[PDB]
Design a protein around this ligand. Structure first.
Ligand SMILES: [Zn+2]
Ligand SMILES: [Zn+2]
Lengths: 106, 134, 196, 179, 57, 443, 65, 49, 57, 69, 44, 286
RNA sequence: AUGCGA
């Protein structure tokens, strides 16, 4: 009993993101994808905005070089996976209230 | 914004057949997460002994491997949606990622199976008869 | 300092019985059946619970101590001048201890028989949190020796695992001996001023 | 010094050069102030900024005195020059930059080539090394990595003296020999 | 003191004639009282005596 | 034939001592923990420990009091100062001062003369004016630093036995000690808490701190690359409050741990909850203590809505004591403080990693309080490391160079409060102030 | 989100002010603007227990054999 | 009892006298400075603590 | 056998007359100052113990 | 320091037997025991004297300050 | 009672731990006294 | 604090301790203990752990005693099962004894702390930094040297000699049990034959002994030196007496000793010297 | 005061 591999997709399409426990965001929230072509690879950073907050996510560079993530969708009946490389980005969400500050001194 | 004087805009994405063979609780589709050391070439695989459920040991370029499958972290028989391992789905090369779902219920889904490839090592046993000379 | 061949026969043969004694006491304080396997998982869990309690650990020391000390008393009572290679009216070491020129029957038993159980502040050897009293001992070893019971004697030497314990007793002795006089000077003076 | 270079007989401007170095370290930082009217010449004076040029010539003549008939325990000279330039270590000389750092590296670069020769010709000497892996390659790669540090700090600290492009190409074509 | 932490002062410089002499024709260098060993249990020192004697012979 | 006499070998070695390598390599390897340590102040990664220390002390900024008649308010020009490099030289002596060819000085002379065995200590001073409008370098001689024998800075470090005898020494001199005024002294090694690792401690002093203090607490002894350490304590108050202990200018300061958490990285409270309890969401004990912590912090500081405000509060509360003033904003003082106090073992830009470690320490602390884990033992060798004398040496140097720059700053401040006679650009002034502070760190 | 007796802001993750203590029949985030249960109404309960240690006794010792 | 625990013999004349001195005031008059206060020799007070 | 450096034998001292502290007129301390050994508090107590009050005075 | 003249224990002059003794260990490649037997050190006091000796004087001698070096 | 290691006053001179009374009055150095390591001797 | 703990096995000497106030305060390193003076190869360890299955700390985003914490120099890099925790610890030790993983210094200290009921808090604490006390032990599975520190030692089963190796238990054995003694404790012959406190007083006497301090005395100017002229090499000695070359500095002499009460002047702690021998220079010193 | 003999 072992699952066969049907197809592999190697180029950027889907991504995975760590958020606070409860993140749901608006029904329409948008995720800005970026690309970096460094040396031979590419580092990705995610950025989004909402009516109050704005969320930006990036890769843990020291784990990227030492681990690489793959996601696939398998069918039991077709025994087939569409494999997808996706960067995992730890993204944080700041609001408009998080953009206020005091004087430069007392 | 479009920050990091080291990034480029995206121009090339790929459709995700989320629902071309989905049916609400009727198609037994799955999405899996697997961790791969860079040392392995994913494109050079052919099948995946994930079907071993637990005994997913695997041998890649004569190298012996173990495919860690875990329920924890996200298939726990305890809480509803124990993960922030968010899925971000695209649509087109000219559109930004989308929150995974299975209908318009504003709820993040989970990965049916999570796997992790860990490189095994012999660590051969001590030959006592050789070491324990009196 | 030598025993007879007989004296070594009794000494080694009696010391042959302590091997059960160590765990037998561990299973008494643990309150588990006799000859309970040295590897029962319940034994190990009960003994880790025991390690975490200072009072329970004290009881474990006290019972193991009484039993192995019964082994000491056995050995000395058997081997004594009953097994020395040359006797009294000629054995100077016995002469000095028994006449009380210097020494005690304890010293003579420590040279000629065995050292016996080392103790510290009133109980058996300190134990690390891993459950091991020395690197060489598996956690919770039910052997008396691993608890600090020294079967070797000064005449034939002591294994390093035992030398590391006898070093313990020797140090803590040097500590009490070197500190008692500072707390006994003030005991003298506090009333010496008054009753003068 | 030249009279001792032209004097095929007794003396190596070196000795005379090293006697001068000790006779004119003057590690004192100063200049300006009074009417230098009998000791103007930047050809005697220094130590505390003002590089002396007989001390720079002592090191340059010393590396050229090390080169002749090396790779063509009584040796030491290329070490003697590594430890005589180290006794320095910033103060007036390196404290000041250039030639100091540069020829130090140049003496050091020559010490890396000699060790590739003494382990070069037809894979080291010849058919392989088996000779316990290559302890000698690791001793040389450590050096090659070091010397690139000395050439870099000599550039960074304003040193216009070094045509970096040629030395890097030479060092890479040489590291090759070490393969 | 010996290498056994059995330290003692020299009480007197005994005349050699007054020392005890062995049948080997020698009289000791140092005499240490036996009564020290029963408390200290320095039996290593006894062993060092017999080993140094063998090792000289 | 078991422990036979090495007799001919000895007489050969006595008559003809080794000319290449001492025998008894354990004999030199025994003081290796001293000598090697002292070598780490002059050789190693980046430049050796001492140069990393001087790169971490950074700058000491002073404003001529803003004057220029916004001139004033916006500082009357910046006067950046610092120390770039630190060099140590082998002992030398020139007689009759300048013009007395120098000679390498060997220890035998220091002993016979009954004097110290000093090395000239030099450090490349950086005098930065207007943040960079004008840069001035000067390597100042700071007197004779006592050098360790056989160290990477003593002439005998690399002498073969034969040469060593030719230099009037015991053919085997281990070294590792210091000749100070002719008396040989070494720095006694010390056993200190193992660095960089949280050790769970129950201590009644913690109860002695005041009301609502429990016994339980975590202690991590963070040591910087340069090896200076900074101990950080967490206390579980009986009330569920968690307080963070640190020490600055050998004074103690207490801060709520939730403040240093929101201060390190922008995060949600739910992010801290997930950091602490994780999948363990079912521990009512832990869930409730965490509710006390978060609800209480939200109670105290309802207006700290984002990390920036928090950093501003820390800068506002410590600027009086970090002596960064006449230059830094409360945001800068806050961030430099975090970098200077909290888990310094993780280093600058470790603020997410310092975040993870800080959550790990709170979680371990709750495991101690509940009793689900044993306490650790400060006195077990398990939990201890050894401060080598040479590193103590490097620390005291780092602090003394901080004092030397602080003394420059004090001298400028006194001059500006009695004369303000001259602007920071004049080189004459550089020589004048510099010649007015005491720079003899060697002594 | 609700955990135990804590309920976090759903949008921002802030531990929003407890619905039981609000001065309105609504709850709003101090980081986000979300309005209380409105969608659903919490019923905060926790089954808290003793640590099974605070209460040493001879009878507890009789529970160990 | 304290000496008997160490199997030391001490004449009762010693202990019994000491106790009588501890009761010289009809109380449990310790031997520290506090008990010393009430004795009449001022130099003895000066010369203790 | 090894000779310990503490030949306290050589460290003997006697004082039948010597220097005094200026604030007390009592013998200075230290072998090298020809100082006088101390009669400590306990030795005083002991001399009273013996009843030897004329020896104590 | 230097080979003692006589054996502490016995009294027999031994200081003459050092150099020949070292020669007997070198020249004849003999063993220390047999060499001492041929030198007449037939008592263990005399035996230990030479056997255990430590001729440290040679190590002292390289420190002679009265000659340039 | 004043306002590092300020010279001690008469109270410190007279007490401090033991005091003048204890260190120069209840016990003193004495003349006509000697100290030496004792050695045994059975014939005396 | 003075209590001699078992953690010190191999690190501090159980017999090299002064007698008095310092007892227990002035410990002494074992003759084979080493001290790290550098730090290395920390940079590749995240990569190797990640290869071994450590989840990166950003992605697990969960924490507890129910899980092993992998940390490197106190930098928490990930989380795993306790089972995978120990598998990693052991396979890591294998790559340490091997020579194939340059990101893996022989002197890395690999702190595994297994799960324990109310035990020490679990985790896998690696350490590479300075001031670690480190000592060699013989790793049996590769029959090669391994460096162990005091933290990891607690949970490691080190047989003291090969014949006492228990099956499936001791993963290492001491190279020699003399490695647990300090230097002076090794110089004492048959030191395992005396009552311990006499060995410690032996360290204090041999350490207080008048011997040969050097040979460069004509170029020192000590406030005091004690120089024994008649120095000898013990017939009875440890082989570490040669391995440390202490024979360069002989501190005593081989004496003919009679263990005899005879004259009546040798009681308790007093011993007699031969007159003719003392006249012949016995223990003669300057 | 630090180290140490008793
Ligand atoms: Zn919100
Ligand atoms: Zn003789």
């Amino acid at each position: 009993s072992e699952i066969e591999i049907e197809s592999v997709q190697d180029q950027p399409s889907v991504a995975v993101g760590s958020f606070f426990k409860g993140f749901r965001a608006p029904s329409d929230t948008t995720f800005d994808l970026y690309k970096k072509k460094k040396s031979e690879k590419d580092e990705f950073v995610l950025h989004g905005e909402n009516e109050r907050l704005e969320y930006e996510g990036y890769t843990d560079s020291s784990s990227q070089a030492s681990n690489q993530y793959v996601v696939g969708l398998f069918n039991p009946e077709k025994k087939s996976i569409q494999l997808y490389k996706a960067p995992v980005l730890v993204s944080k969400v700041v609001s408009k209230s998080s953009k206020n500050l005091r004087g430069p001194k007392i | 914004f479009s920050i990091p004087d080291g990034f480029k805009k995206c121009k090339h994405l790929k459709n995700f057949p989320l629902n071309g063979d989905n049916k609400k609780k009727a198609k037994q589709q799955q999405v899996w997460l697997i961790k791969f050391p860079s040392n392995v070439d994913i494109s050079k695989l052919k099948s995946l002994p994930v079907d071993f459920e637990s005994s997913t040991t695997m041998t890649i370029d004569k190298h012996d491997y173990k495919i860690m499958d875990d329920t924890d972290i996200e298939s726990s028989l305890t809480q509803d949606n124990l993960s922030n391992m968010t899925l971000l789905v695209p649509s087109e090369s000219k559109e930004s990622l989308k929150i995974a779902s299975t209908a318009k219920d504003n709820a993040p889904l989970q990965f049916d199976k999570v796997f992790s490839v860990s490189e095994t090592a012999k660590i051969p046993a001590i030959d006592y008869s050789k070491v324990r000379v009196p | 300092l030598r025993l007879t061949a007989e004296g070594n026969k009794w000494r080694t043969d009696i010391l042959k019985t302590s091997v059960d004694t160590g765990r037998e006491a561990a299973a008494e304080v643990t309150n588990l059946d006799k000859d309970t396997p040295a590897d029962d998982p319940e034994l190990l869990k009960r003994l880790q619970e025991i390690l975490r309690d200072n009072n329970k650990s004290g009881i474990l020391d006290a019972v193991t101590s009484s039993k192995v000390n019964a082994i000491t008393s056995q050995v000395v009572s058997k081997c004594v001048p009953d097994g020395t290679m040359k006797k009294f009216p000629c054995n100077s070491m016995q002469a000095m201890a028994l006449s009380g020129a210097k020494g005690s029957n304890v010293n003579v038993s420590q040279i000629m028989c065995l050292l016996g159980q080392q103790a510290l502040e009133g109980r058996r050897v300190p134990v690390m949190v891993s459950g091991k009293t020395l690197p060489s001992f598996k956690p919770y070893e039910t052997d008396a020796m691993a608890g600090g019971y020294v079967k070797g004697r000064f005449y034939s030497g002591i294994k390093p695992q035992e030398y590391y314990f006898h070093c313990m007793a020797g140090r803590e002795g040097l500590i009490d001996t070197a500190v008692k006089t500072s707390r006994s000077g003030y005991l003298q003076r506090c009333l010496t001023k008054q009753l003068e | 010094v030249e009279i001792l270079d032209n004097l095929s007989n007794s003396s190596s401007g070196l000795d005379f050069l090293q006697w001068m170095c000790q006779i004119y370290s003057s590690k004192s930082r100063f200049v300006q102030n009074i009417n230098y009217r009998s000791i103007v010449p930047p050809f005697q004076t220094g130590s505390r900024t003002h590089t002396a040029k007989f001390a720079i010539t002592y090191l340059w003549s010393s590396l050229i005195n090390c080169q002749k008939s090396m790779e063509p325990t009584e040796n030491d000279l290329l070490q003697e020059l590594i430890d005589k330039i180290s006794e320095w270590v910033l103060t007036p000389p390196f404290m000041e930059d250039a030639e100091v750092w540069f020829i130090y590296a140049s003496c050091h670069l020559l010490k890396a080539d000699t060790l590739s020769r003494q382990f070069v010709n037809d894979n080291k000497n010849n058919d392989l090394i088996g000779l316990d892996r290559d302890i000698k390659i690791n001793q040389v790669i450590k050096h090659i990595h070091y010397v690139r540090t000395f050439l870099k700090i000599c550039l960074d600290k304003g040193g216009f003296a070094v045509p970096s492009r040629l030395i890097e190409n030479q060092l890479k074509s040489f590291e090759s020999r070490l393969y | 003191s010996s290498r056994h932490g059995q330290k003692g002062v020299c009480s007197r410089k005994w005349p050699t004639i007054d020392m005890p002499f062995s049948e080997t024709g020698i009289q000791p260098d140092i005499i240490i009282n036996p009564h020290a060993f029963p408390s200290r249990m320095t039996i290593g020192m006894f062993v060092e005596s017999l080993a140094g004697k063998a090792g000289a012979l | 034939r078991t422990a036979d006499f090495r007799t001919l070998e000895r007489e050969s070695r006595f008559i003809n001592p080794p000319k290449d390598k001492s025998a008894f390599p354990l004999l030199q390897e025994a003081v290796q923990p001293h000598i090697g340590s002292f070598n780490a102040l002059t050789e190693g990664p980046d430049g050796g420990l001492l140069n990393l220390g001087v790169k971490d002390i950074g700058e000491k900024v002073i404003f001529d009091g803003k004057p220029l008649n916004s001139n004033s308010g916006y500082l009357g020009n910046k006067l950046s100062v610092s120390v770039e490099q630190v060099s140590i030289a082998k002992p030398m002596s020139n007689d009759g001062v300048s013009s007395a060819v120098e000679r390498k000085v060997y220890p035998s002379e220091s002993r016979q003369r009954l004097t110290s065995y000093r090395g000239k200590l030099l450090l490349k001073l950086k005098w930065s004016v207007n943040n960079g409008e004008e840069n001035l370098f000067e390597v100042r001689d700071c007197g004779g630093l006592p050098v360790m024998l056989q160290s990477n800075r003593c002439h005998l470090n690399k002498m073969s036995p034969y040469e060593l005898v030719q230099h009037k020494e015991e053919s085997d001199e281990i070294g590792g000690y210091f000749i100070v005024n002719g008396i040989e002294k070494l720095i006694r090694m010390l056993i200190v808490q193992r660095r960089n690792h949280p050790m769970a401690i129950i201590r009644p002093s913690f109860a002695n701190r005041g009301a609502s203090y429990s016994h339980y607490g975590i202690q991590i002894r963070s040591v910087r690359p340069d090896q200076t350490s900074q101990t950080n304590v967490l206390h579980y108050l009986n009330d569920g409050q968690v307080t963070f202990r640190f020490s600055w200018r050998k004074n103690e300061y207490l801060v709520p741990v939730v403040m240093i958490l929101k201060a390190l990285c922008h995060t949600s409270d739910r992010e801290i909850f997930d950091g602490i309890i994780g999948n363990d969401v079912k521990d009512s004990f832990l869930t409730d203590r965490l509710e006390l912590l978060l609800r209480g912090f939200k109670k105290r500081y309802p207006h700290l809505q984002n990390r920036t405000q928090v950093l501003q509060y820390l800068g506002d509360k410590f600027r009086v004591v970090f002596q960064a003033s006449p230059d830094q904003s409360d945001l800068e003082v806050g961030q430099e403080v975090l970098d200077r106090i909290v888990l310094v073992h993780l280093g600058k830009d470790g603020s997410q990693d310092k975040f993870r470690m800080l959550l790990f320490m709170i979680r371990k602390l709750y495991s101690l309080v509940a009793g689900e884990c044993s306490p650790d033992n400060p006195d077990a060798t398990q939990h201890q490391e050894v401060l080598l004398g040479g590193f103590l040496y490097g620390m005291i140097l780092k602090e003394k160079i901080d004092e030397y720059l602080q003394n420059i700053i004090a001298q400028v401040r006194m001059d500006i409060n009695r004369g303000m006679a001259i602007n920071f650009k004049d080189k004459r002034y550089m020589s004048r102030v510099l010649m007015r502070v005491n720079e003899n760190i060697g002594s | 989100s609700v955990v135990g007796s804590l309920i976090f802001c759903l949008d921002c993750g802030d531990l929003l002010e407890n619905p039981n203590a609000v001065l309105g029949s609504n709850v709003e985030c101090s980081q986000c603007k979300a309005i209380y249960p409105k969608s659903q109404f919490s019923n905060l309960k926790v089954v808290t227990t003793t640590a099974d240690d605070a209460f040493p006794s001879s009878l507890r010792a009789k529970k160990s054999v | 009892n304290v000496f008997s625990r160490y199997a030391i013999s001490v004449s009762f004349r010693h202990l019994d006298l000491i106790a009588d001195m501890m009761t010289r005031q009809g109380t449990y008059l310790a031997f520290n400075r506090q008990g010393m206060e009430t004795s009449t020799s001022s130099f003895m007070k000066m010369s203790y603590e | 056998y090894q000779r310990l450096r503490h030949m306290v034998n050589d460290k003997f001292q006697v004082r039948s007359t010597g220097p005094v502290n200026s604030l007390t007129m009592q013998p200075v301390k230290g072998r090298k100052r020809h100082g006088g050994i101390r009669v400590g508090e306990m030795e005083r107590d002991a001399l009273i113990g013996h009843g030897t009050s004329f020896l104590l005075q | 320091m230097i080979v003692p003249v006589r054996c502490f224990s016995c009294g027999k002059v031994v200081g003459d037997k050092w150099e020949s003794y070292l020669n007997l260990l070198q020249e004849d490649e003999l063993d220390e025991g047999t060499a001492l037997s041929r030198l007449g050190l037939k008592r263990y006091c005399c035996r230990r004297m030479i056997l255990t000796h430590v001729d440290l004087i040679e190590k002292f001698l390289r420190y002679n300050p009265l000659e340039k070096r | 009672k004043a306002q590092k290691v300020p010279i001690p006053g008469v109270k410190q001179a007279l007490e401090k731990k033991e005091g003048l009374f204890r260190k120069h009055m209840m016990g003193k150095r004495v003349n006509y006294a000697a100290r030496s390591v004792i050695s045994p001797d059975p014939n005396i | 604090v003075r209590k001699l703990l078992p953690e010190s096995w191999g690190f501090l000497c159980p017999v090299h301790t002064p007698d008095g106030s310092p007892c227990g305060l002035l410990n002494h390193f074992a003759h084979k203990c080493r001290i790290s003076t550098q730090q290395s190869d920390v940079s590749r360890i995240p990569s190797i752990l990640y290869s071994l299955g450590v989840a990166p700390a950003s992605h697990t985003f969960a924490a507890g005693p129910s899980l092993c914490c992998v940390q490197i120099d106190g930098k928490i890099i990930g989380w795993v099962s306790h089972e995978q925790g120990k598998i990693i610890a052991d396979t890591l030790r294998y790559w340490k004894v091997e020579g194939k993983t340059p990101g893996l210094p022989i002197d890395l200290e690999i702190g595994y702390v297994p799960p324990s009921t109310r035990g020490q808090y679990p985790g896998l604490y690696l350490f590479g930094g300075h001031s670690r006390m480190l000592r060699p032990v013989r790793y049996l599975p590769l029959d090669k040297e391994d460096i162990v520190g005091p933290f990891e030692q607690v949970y490691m089963n080190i047989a003291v000699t090969p014949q006492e190796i228990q099956n499936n238990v001791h993963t290492h054995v001491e190279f020699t049990p003399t490695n647990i003694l300090s230097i002076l404790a090794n110089l004492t012959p048959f030191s395992d034959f005396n009552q311990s406190p006499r060995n410690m007083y032996q360290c204090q006497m041999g350490k207080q002994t008048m011997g040969t301090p050097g040979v460069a005395l004509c170029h020192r100017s000590d406030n005091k030196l004690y120089r024994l002229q008649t120095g000898q090499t013990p017939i009875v000695k440890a082989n570490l007496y040669d391995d440390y070359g202490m024979d360069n500095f002989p501190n005593g002499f081989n004496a003919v000793v009679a263990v005899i009460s005879y004259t009546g002047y040798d009681m308790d702690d007093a011993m007699i010297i031969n007159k003719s021998a003392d006249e012949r220079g016995f223990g003669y010193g300057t």
